[PDB]
Every structure is written in C-alpha cells, then in structure tokens.
Amino acid sequence: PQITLWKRPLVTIKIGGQLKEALLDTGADDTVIEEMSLPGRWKPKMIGGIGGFIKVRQYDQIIIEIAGHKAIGTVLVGPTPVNIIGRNLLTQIGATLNF
Amino acid sequence: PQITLWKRPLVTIKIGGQLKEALLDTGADDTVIEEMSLPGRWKPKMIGGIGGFIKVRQYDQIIIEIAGHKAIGTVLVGPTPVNIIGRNLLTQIGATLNF
Ligand SMILES: CC(C)CN(C[C@@H](O)[C@H](Cc1ccccc1)NC(=O)O[C@H]1CCOC1)S(=O)(=O)c1ccc(N)cc1
Ligand SMILES: [Cl-]
C-alpha cells in the first residue's frame, strides 16, 4: 500500500506464531520487539536514542510477516515502548519513502 | 524522490540559514533537532523515545527546508542523538511509505 503519515504507520505483524502491532520506522536501524520468546541463539546488545539506551537480546534469522509480506532477518527483543519494524526488515519488503 | 532503506535516510535540511544533516524518521511523531538558536517563544514538551521520556523546547511556525522541500512547522530542540525529521514535517512535504 501507500501509507500516509498523519498518524503513526502501524501494521499487524506475525512473529513467533504471535500477532502484534508494530510501527514501520525508517529511523530505526534494526527491528525491536517487546518481550517474547524466540528460537535459537542470541547475544546481548545495547540500543539507544531519545531518552537513552536499553539492553536487548539479538536473535538472527527470524521470519516476520509484515502486513502480509514475509521477511527474514535479525530481531532484537527487550523493553521497547513500542514494537518497531526497522530498516533491516523494511528493505526486504521493498519499502520506500516517497515525496 | 524514492528513498530506499539500505542505508539511513539522511538528507540535508536548512534551518536558520544553515545546512544540517537529518534523518527522515517515520517512527518519530515530532521533529527534534540538536541545540541551536531559533527565534521567538518556546513552550515545554515531553517526548518519548526508546529510553524514556525527556523534556524539549517547542518552537512553532519555524521555516525549514527538507531535501529542498520548503516547510513551516513545529521544531523541537533538545538532547537528541541526531536531527530527526518526524511525521509532522514528513506529512507537510508529502512523504508516504510505499511497498
Ligand atoms: C531516535 C532514532 C534515531 C532511533 N529510534 C527510532 C525512532 O523512530 C523512535 C521510535 C520510538 C517511538 C516511540 C517510542 C519509542 C521509540 N522515535 C522517537 O524517538 O520518536 C521521538 C523523537 C521525536 O518524536 C518522538 S530508536 O527507537 O531509538 C531505535 C534505535 C535503534 C533500533 N535498532 C531501533 C530503534
Ligand atoms: Cl538483518
């Protein structure tokens, strides 16, 4: 679709067999989701921005369906205020910002 | 333009006669720029980011150019990792997400 920016660009995602609402975020390097279980290995990471940093778990090679479009990549998991689809997965669904 | 997301969507902005680099950030409700001098009165605002809520200064009706596109709107000033062009100004310039 073409999504305007009058309101937050929220979509439904499917991750880890769960449905979640998430923000399509061109300002986020990497996808970060609220606490949930994911399979496989992980390693700790710190990410930061407005308000400072949080500690997350980095899981690689995770499949997320994003508004009906499947994509695989790294998913960070931790105490994010909002679920965020970042550039690492936006690229895979062919998302662009147009003006 | 059509901006892909393989790298950060950084553009040049012009504010206060000066060129600066800024990030086109669909996950940011608001535009926030690093400390600088802007004209007029300001009002307080709280904004939330990944690490928590912070206080910033809100300036209204500020002239700003974004990638050559003229805008006039609200600019926040405060402790910010990067200059952020958020949805208030992305909407002005006609930016949409597309996939
Ligand atoms: C600040 C940018 C440069 C980076 N962030 C993305 C931003 O879109 C961020 C997303 C968000 C929205 C609402 C609550 C919390 C976070 N919005 C944001 O702070 O909105 C403020 C600034 C003005 O308007 C309000 S991030 O969340 O720190 C981040 C960092 C690393 C990763 N991998 C993922 C996310
Ligand atoms: Cl990735």
Ligand SMILES: [Cl-]
């Ligand atoms: Cl591409």
Ligand SMILES: [Cl-]
């Ligand atoms: Cl505005």
Ligand code: NA
């Ligand atoms: Na993995």
